Amino acid sequence: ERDCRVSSFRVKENFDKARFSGTWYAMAKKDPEGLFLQDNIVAEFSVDETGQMSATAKGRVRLLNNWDVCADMVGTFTDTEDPAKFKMKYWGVASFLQKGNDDHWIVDTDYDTYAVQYSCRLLNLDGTCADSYSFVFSRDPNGLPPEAQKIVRQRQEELCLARQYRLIVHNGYC
Numbered sequence: 351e352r353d354c355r356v357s358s359f360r361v362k363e364n365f366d367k368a369r370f371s372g373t374w375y376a377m378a379k380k381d382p383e384g385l386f387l388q389d390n391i392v393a394e395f396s397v398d399e400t401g402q403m404s405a406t407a408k409g410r411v412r413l414l415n416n417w418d419v420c421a422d423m424v425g426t427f428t429d430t431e432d433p434a435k436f437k438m439k440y441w442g443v444a445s446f447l448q449k450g451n452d453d454h455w456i457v458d459t460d461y462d463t464y465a466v467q468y469s470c471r472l473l474n475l476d477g478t479c480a481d482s483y484s485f486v487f488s489r490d491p492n493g494l495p496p497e498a499q500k501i502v503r504q505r506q507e508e509l510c511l512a513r514q515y516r517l518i519v520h521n522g523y524c
């Protein structure tokens with residue numbers, strides 16, 4: 351009876367790009383189809399004076415046949431009418447790395463502790479998501495405090511994803 355239509359999902363009110371800048375460690379991920387980033391995922395967000403948000407990311411990706419590389423990725427965000435909803439053009443510093451353009455929603459954050467991100471790459475015909483991914487980020491690479499963890503769990507459930515995350519390990523691979 352809970353609403354899993356993407357159009358129903360709340361996102362961060364009055365999202366502040368500047369406050370969101372800096373280092374975010376991925377603690378957990380819900381994978382899309384054909385998953386790319388595997389683990390050791392760290393993102394760096396910036397805003398320029400134009401107010402244009404961008405990011406870089408490092409992580410282990412596993413090219414099939416069991417070949418691990420540390421991907422170095424770049425993203426730039428185009429604003430929409432909602433301050434928390436963006437279009438993210440992304441690519442790798444190496445041209446053979448995955449590129450594309452995904453929706454990028456900041457579902458919730460308190461800026462200095464946790465963030466929940468969401469992307470629906472493809473809708474179902476009933477408005478639910480056919481192919482989604484989601485990152486939970488922490489400022490502290492050692493994880494979230496309990497109050498933040500509990501808030502995040504609520505947000506995960508609201509996205510209809512709470513059963514579908516896996517933990518992201520950080521072990522200096524990159």
Ligand SMILES: CCCCCCCCCCCCCCCC(=O)O
Pocket residue numbers: 381382384385386387388393405406407423424425438440441467483485
């Ligand atoms: C959304 C993660 C951080 C945002 C920083 C954008 C920098 C490019 C990251 C590329 C994400 C594309 C792969 C995401 C889906 C996946 O890993 O399976």
Ligand SMILES: [Cl-]
Pocket residue numbers: 499500503
């Ligand atoms: Cl709990």
Ligand SMILES: [Cl-]
Pocket residue numbers: 512513514
């Ligand atoms: Cl669960």
